[PDB]
Amino acid sequence: IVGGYTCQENSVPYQVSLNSGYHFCGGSLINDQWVVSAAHCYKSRIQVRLGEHNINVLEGNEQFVNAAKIIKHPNFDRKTLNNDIMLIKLSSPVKLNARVATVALPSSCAPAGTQCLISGWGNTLSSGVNEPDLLQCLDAPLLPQADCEASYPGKITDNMVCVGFLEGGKDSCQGDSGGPVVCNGELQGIVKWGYGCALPDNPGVYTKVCNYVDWIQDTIAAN
Template sequence: MRTSITLILAITAACAAASKVTHKAVHPKDLILQQNRNSNAGRITNGNHASEGQIPYIVGISLNSNGNWWWCGGSIIGHTWVLTAAHCTVEADEASLYYGAINYEAPAFRHGVTKNDFIVHPEYRGLTHDISLIKTPHVDFYSIVNKVELPSLNDRYNSFENSWALASGWGEIYDGSNVVEDLSVVELQVVPLADCQAYFGTETADENVICVSTPDGKSTCHGDSGGPLVTNDGNLLIGITSFGSDYGCQTGAPAGFTRVTSYLEWIKDETGIYY
């Protein structure tokens, strides 16, 4: 009898957890809103404009496949390497990388690459293992173009829970708009993985995901895919913009990032970069 009661309680708990999954996850790049789902205005969203040199490690990435163009962000992690999301590069034939840009129409310089320069994680499928490397021509570092450090190998099990971090990008200024010319930044707090799983389920929000809260309409949005999440304490790259709610960027659902610490060995093997 006791075993039966325990089993019933376990099943009930599992059903209760499943019932909390209220949002379908979608890559910001692919976000298409139904009319009138959300009418709140905002920026990256409800962030602030970045100042020159504030985010020297970000690159804007314009990608193309057979004449179809889309926009993503990425992070400089070495003189010849940019880290971004797999869903940004997996279907692309070529890309232009914009360095040192506050306004993306006026970068310090640009480099072009092709699909031969993309290294998509071999286990990438939809929302899982959403990480990709781009091999670039050599870039010299200075005040407005510089690398961001990865967490050390000793930090591979650090959840960064409750840490404050900065997300940045040229994404939509409100749900349904276009990407914007000026780089925006927003400070967001890392939440327990369980909070993210309550919205998206455990298959989407697995151990390779890190999530942040999105209070007051502050979030990443369409056009921010692949961009960085960098800790205020230590300036470490801990996340890559990966997914949000299909209801829009300003619903209050957590924003999901690829957890960089899960891929430190893979990055090391492909690039030789590690700390």
């Protein structure tokens, strides 16, 4: 997260860190046994870490759980990043509590202008790389599709939404990928991509979760 602020400890309880011996992507806990992330975050073996604040220090709220089933969207297009959504079934249910909680799926697609919260342990610089210890937070609005398309001529599908600021300075970045965009308590986006990070005229692009509730439900039910 570039230009965000340090979240209050355990204030984003649905936030998870995907680990492979190092943090490489975020995700969201949607039920005691399933995590939603980005298909581009796929790895054959993943340890999901919940209840994290300081990614490098054991603080006593952590739950570490291996992924049992990693299911990328059948239509994920690695090239265009269309359908960049993945489901992780954990090897065992987590203990839900105050620091480890679920986020709701969207009842409807959010209108442009709604204020959302984005979080992650992603890169904090607009240039170069800086990995933070503490979870970062960013308040940012969902932009009109026209602004999104305009910024990325020919690349935005209807499964994508832009969130951020046309002025730059504030945005998600590498390492925030697969992480959540929560608006009015519902998961509306997944950190996907953007050109650079926090650059003027290059808002972040996110997977539009409201287009996948059916799929998410079907999959959970079938697995």
